[PDB]
Amino acid sequence: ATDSKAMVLLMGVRRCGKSSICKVVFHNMQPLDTLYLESTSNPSLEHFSTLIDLAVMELPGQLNYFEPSYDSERLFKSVGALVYVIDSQDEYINAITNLAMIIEYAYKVNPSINIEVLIHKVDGLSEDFKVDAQRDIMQRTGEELLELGLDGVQVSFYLTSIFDHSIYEAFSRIVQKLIPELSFLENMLDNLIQHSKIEKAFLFDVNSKIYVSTDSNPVDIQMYEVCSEFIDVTIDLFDLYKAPRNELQNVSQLANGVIIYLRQMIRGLALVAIIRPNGTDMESCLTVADYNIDIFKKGLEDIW
Amino acid sequence: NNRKKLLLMGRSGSGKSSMRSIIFSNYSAFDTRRLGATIDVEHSHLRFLGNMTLNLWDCGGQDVFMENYFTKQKDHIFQMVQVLIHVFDVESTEVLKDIEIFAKALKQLRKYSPDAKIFVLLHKMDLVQLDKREELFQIMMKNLSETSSEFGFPNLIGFPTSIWDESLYKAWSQIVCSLIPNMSNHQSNLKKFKEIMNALEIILFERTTFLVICSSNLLDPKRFEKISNIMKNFKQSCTKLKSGFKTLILNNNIYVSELSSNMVCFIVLKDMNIPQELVLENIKKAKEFFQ
Ligand SMILES: Nc1nc2c(ncn2[C@@H]2O[C@H](COP(=O)(O)OP(=O)(O)OP(=O)(O)O)[C@@H](O)[C@H]2O)c(=O)[nH]1
Ligand SMILES: Nc1nc2c(ncn2[C@@H]2O[C@H](COP(=O)(O)OP(=O)(O)O)[C@@H](O)[C@H]2O)c(=O)[nH]1
Ligand SMILES: [Mg+2]
Numbered sequence: 001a002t003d004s005k006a007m008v009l010l011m012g013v014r015r016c017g018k019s020s021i022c023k024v025v026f027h028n029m030q031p032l033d034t035l036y037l038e039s040t041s042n043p044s045l046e047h048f049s050t051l052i053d054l055a056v057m058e059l060p061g062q063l064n065y066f067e068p069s070y071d072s073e074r075l076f077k078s079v080g081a082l083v084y085v086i087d088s089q090d091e092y093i094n095a096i097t098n099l100a101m102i103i104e105y106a107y108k109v110n111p112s113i114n115i116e117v118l119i120h121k122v123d124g125l126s127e128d129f130k131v132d133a134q135r136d137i138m139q140r141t142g143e144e145l146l147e148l149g150l151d152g153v154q155v156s157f158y159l160t161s162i163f164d165h166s167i168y169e170a171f172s173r174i175v176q177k178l179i180p181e182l183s184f185l186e187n188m189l190d191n192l193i194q195h196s197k198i199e200k201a202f203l204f205d206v207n208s209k210i211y212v213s214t215d216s217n218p219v220d221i222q223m224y225e226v227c228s229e230f231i232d233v234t235i236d237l238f239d240l241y242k243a244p245r246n247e248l249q250n251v252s253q254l255a256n257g258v259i260i261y262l263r264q265m266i267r268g269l270a271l272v273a274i275i276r277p278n279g280t281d282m283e284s285c286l287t288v289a290d291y292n293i294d295i296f297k298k299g300l301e302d303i304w
Numbered sequence: 305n306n307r308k309k310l311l312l313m314g315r316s317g318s319g320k321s322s323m324r325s326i327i328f329s330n331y332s333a334f335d336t337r338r339l340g341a342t343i344d345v346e347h348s349h350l351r352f353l354g355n356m357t358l359n360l361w362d363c364g365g366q367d368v369f370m371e372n373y374f375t376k377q378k379d380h381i382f383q384m385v386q387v388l389i390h391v392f393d394v395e396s397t398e399v400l401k402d403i404e405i406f407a408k409a410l411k412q413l414r415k416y417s418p419d420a421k422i423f424v425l426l427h428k429m430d431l432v433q434l435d436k437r438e439e440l441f442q443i444m445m446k447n448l449s450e451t452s453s454e455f456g457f458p459n460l461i462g463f464p465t466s467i468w469d470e471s472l473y474k475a476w477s478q479i480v481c482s483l484i485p486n487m488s489n490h491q492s493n494l495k496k497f498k499e500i501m502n503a504l505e506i507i508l509f510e511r512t513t514f515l516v517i518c519s520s521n522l523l524d525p526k527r528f529e530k531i532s533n534i535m536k537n538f539k540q541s542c543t544k545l546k547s548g549f550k551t552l553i554l555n556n557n558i559y560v561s562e563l564s565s566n567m568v569c570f571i572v573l574k575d576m577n578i579p580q581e582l583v584l585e586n587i588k589k590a591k592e593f594f595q
Pocket of ligand 1: 337
């Protein structure tokens with residue numbers, strides 16, 4: 001059994017990747033299950049075993065000859081989020097179909113349900129391809145559900161690949177959307193970047209690609225890809241030569257001036273931010289971040 | 305001469321187009337799937353380090369195309385050839401034929417460009433199991449060496465490669481470091497840079513490809529390529545920001561800066577807090593000599 005806080009459901013046709021996905025996610029969620037459960041344990045709602053638990057469901061080619069029995073429904077309710085895996089290797093029209101079904105049916109029984117859809121196995125595909133692929137899929141459901149009479153259902157679509165970093169960036173948002181109890185940290189970040197020359201901030205555990213938290217800033221610029229890799233640079237470059245700022249830190253600046261800043265926060269937990277200075281030089285732009293950061297750092301040190 | 309012509313030959317699927325694509329076109333490993341078989345000879349050039357330019361000849365290896373390079377256009381192909389990077393797919397079944405074709409190429413070279421440098425790559429080594437990866441290379445290089453020897457070119461260089469690790473950069477670094485004439489002055493200038501920085505060591509990379517040009521010093525022997533690889537992986541995550549890499553400082557110990565529109569330097573500093581300012585200054589005088 002599993003006394004977890006959330007109950008995600010992974011459904012899709014056989015070989016969509018629903019089991020491979022569980023393996024990659026369950027692993028990277030450890031640093032968090034750890035972090036939010038005791039590193040810092042507060043919401044009385046937290047003394048649980050692990051944050052989430054991915055229960056997968058196999059989906060038959062076509063759901064005509066069959067529809068969900070009751071036991072499935074009783075599960076839908078227990079489930080907090082619903083992740084639909086569309087294998088992009090093949091055609092996906094009848095799949096977009098079975099999705100409208102799984103939605104309408106699930107939604108009657110447990111609205112307020114998160115419906116997340118993964119346009120999977122997108123590794124090795126041209127960009128204008130992923131563009132059309134999605135834009136086309138996104139539309140084909142905004143019509144399939146207007147036909148089913150429910151255009152008000154909020155559906156978030158993602159572009160993923162388990163040989164990529166995508167599935168981690170998707171699930172990062174996915175986990176956040178699920179558990180609100182872990183948003184106090186998102187909030188502390190909206191403060192760090194609040195009134196800033198700082199655009200985005202992530203809280204990455206050195207051994208997980210599922211960020212632990214980041215700002216509520218809407219214009220997520222998918223700056224995730226960039227910061228997520230920055231960690232690896234820092235770790236990897238450091239690991240080769242190794243034989244209020246006493247820890248690990250890395251700064252990088254591009255042509256146009258943007259800055260990728262990483263500063264360790266608490267034993268393996270680092271902060272990666274994007275800093276944009278319109279002319280203002282680096283040396284001091286960097287010092288003014290340190291202020292808001294060193295503050296934020298104390299904040300985590302206080303609750304730990 | 306000021307221009308270099310390299311022959312990238314091998315049979316179809318050897319993975320030689322993925323190479324070029326990763327090394328001079330900013331492709332990601334898995335990004336090569338979409339490449340599709342190259343038809344005939346696909347040309348690419350690249351001004352490398354200012355004074356030297358490069359002309360890459362990716363020769364689609366479908367048997368038919370291959371037969372035509374050796375017959376009709378052999379003079380076109382094997383004419384004025386600086387280097388031959390022949391590639392063998394480690395997962396081939398037609399190994400013996402794979403090698404014959406190689407001789408075929410040597411024949412046309414032993415004749416039209418005899419002083420060309422020979423380089424062989426056992427590509428896709430990521431498919432072989434670790435315990436085997438070495439003896440197979442040893443075995444293959446052994447045979448290839450003798451064949452190479454009989455067509456003029458005695459001692460050739462070998463490199464086990466895969467688009468999935470850094471072993472690809474080491475090979476292409478050494479290959480390109482063969483067409484660079486002026487290396488005496490670079491190390492000499494580098495060595496001095498070292499001392500004025502009193503660094504553990506300094507490395508030089510080509511801004512564009514991030515291949516190693518030279519250095520000046522226990523430590524990882526493959527460290528050079530692992531640096532190339534990692535920075536190139538950073539390069540690619542920084543796509544969306546659509547800005548090129550300028551600088552990076554890691555723990556007040558490792559400084560990586562661009563020197564000119566051609567060379568980037570990597571300095572591991574030996575200290576932890578030399579006035580960051582006075583260290584950067586030393587960086588700015590360095591540009592004078594590495595443009
Ligand atoms: N496992 C593994 N696969 C590779 C490697 N390099 C390339 N590939 C794969 O092999 C394929 C071979 O494609 P190419 O590189 O375009 O073919 P080519 O060798 O250039 O030959 P062309 O058809 O003849 O002209 C691509 O589909 C890649 O996914 C490698 O290092 N390891
Ligand atoms: N190229 C690619 N292959 C994938 C991806 N996800 C899963 N696979 C492969 O798809 C196959 C089926 O995955 P699996 O987890 O067994 O599917 P399941 O039956 O739905 O659990 C395996 O060979 C996986 O390695 C992906 O994102 N990209
Ligand atoms: Mg090719």
